[PDB]
Design a protein. Structure first.
Length: 298
DNA sequence: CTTCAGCAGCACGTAGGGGAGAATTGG
RNA sequence: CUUGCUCGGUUCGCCGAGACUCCCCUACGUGCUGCUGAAG
DNA sequence: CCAATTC
């Protein structure tokens, strides 16, 4: 299940004011700082509407509006498994420690010597009762079935300065027959360069790639990022994820690249089939500005 | 003005916790 | 094989060779440096 | 149609 990466193009507001991220942050902050008894007291986080509703009242965690059971479940199981996992880490060493102590004691008993004393344990709780190596908050925003990427159809999605695509039409191809371009137009290969061009099948880089306009010791062309990007989203494929009043729109060109180098798909493929190769629950990075996808089992 | 000694990391590892849905269903 | 990333050739028009299991977190070595004390 | 249920 390899991962595939995708860049963002627009969003309503920064992914920090989202109810999902705020609720996950509050839940984590509450759970990580629990005592080894309060963990078992508040560990009956439910799976239904009523159980997950009454847990928030019992534990008092602020709720910013988020109520999705599928979206409130993915940010409680992870938090409690991380809490339990730190204890699992501090108790993993003690298993081999006890095994080694038992082996040494058995060897001494066989030799006749009395068993040697060993350290009891290295627990994870200090005088305050809380946990020593308290975990850090995960900024990842995990998606779910109810909110899955779909083709950006402007029928209901809001008005953006973007283009539109047919989910049924096959995906466009990257300027076939490169050596037919008028002079003075983007992508033009001068005549001296046409001899000794690559004949093997490889990635077809676009004119407005960032690798062709970048600072380099022997590159005298001037970098114009403002135009290099403003003329780069015209040929973009837009996929949209939507939780509430939020409308992340992405670029399904990373997905298109991903499907073409693991022996998966060819130029004859519609948008619906493109993201039908991927799991419907991507992971979002609020600070880096990237979305991560995963293939299916096939 | 040389050896140490218990701490911190702009950076590199490592080591070990956690994680990365969808099909059947109900107002 | 349209975005993204790495390394390069160029008349600067874009050309070539690549990698693609990723993220988060708490610890912990290393020179670097800082903070003290022994040593003629 | 689209939030909630088990797996």
């Amino acid at each position: 299940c390899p991962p595939a990466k995708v860049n963002i193009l627009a969003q309503s507001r920064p992914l920090s004011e989202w109810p999902i991220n705020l609720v996950s942050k509050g839940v984590q902050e509450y759970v990580y700082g629990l005592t080894a008894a309060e963990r078992e007291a508040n560990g009956d986080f439910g799976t239904s509407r009523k159980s997950l509703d009454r847990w928030f009242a019992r534990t008092g965690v602020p709720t910013h509006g988020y109520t999705t059971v599928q979206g409130l479940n993915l940010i409680l199981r992870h938090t409690f498994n991380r809490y339990d996992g730190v204890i699992k880490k501090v108790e993993t060493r003690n298993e081999k420690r006890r095994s080694k102590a038992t082996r040494i004691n058995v060897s001494r008993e066989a030799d006749g010597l009395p068993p040697i004393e060993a350290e009891p344990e290295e627990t994870a709780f200090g005088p305050d009762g809380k946990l020593k190596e308290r975990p850090g908050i995960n900024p990842s925003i995990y998606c779910y079935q109810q909110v899955s990427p779909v083709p950006y159809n402007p029928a209901k999605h809001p008005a953006l300065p973007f283009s539109g695509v047919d989910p049924g039409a096959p995906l466009p191809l990257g300027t076939p027959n490169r050596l037919s371009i008028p002079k003075g137009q983007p992508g033009y290969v001068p005549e001296w360069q046409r001899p000794h061009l690559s004949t093997k099948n490889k990635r077809i880089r676009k004119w407005y790639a960032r690798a062709n306009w970048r600072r380099k010791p022997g590159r005298k062309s001037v970098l114009d990022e403002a135009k290099l990007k403003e003329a780069a989203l015209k040929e973009a494929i837009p996929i949209i994820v939507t939780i509430g009043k939020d409308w992340i729109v992405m670029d399904a060109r990373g997905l298109l690249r991903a499907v073409y180098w693991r022996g998966i798909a060819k130029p004859g493929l519609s948008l619906k089939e493109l993201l039908g190769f991927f799991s419907g629950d991507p992971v979002l990075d609020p600070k880096r500005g990237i979305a991560t996808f995963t293939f299916k089992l096939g």
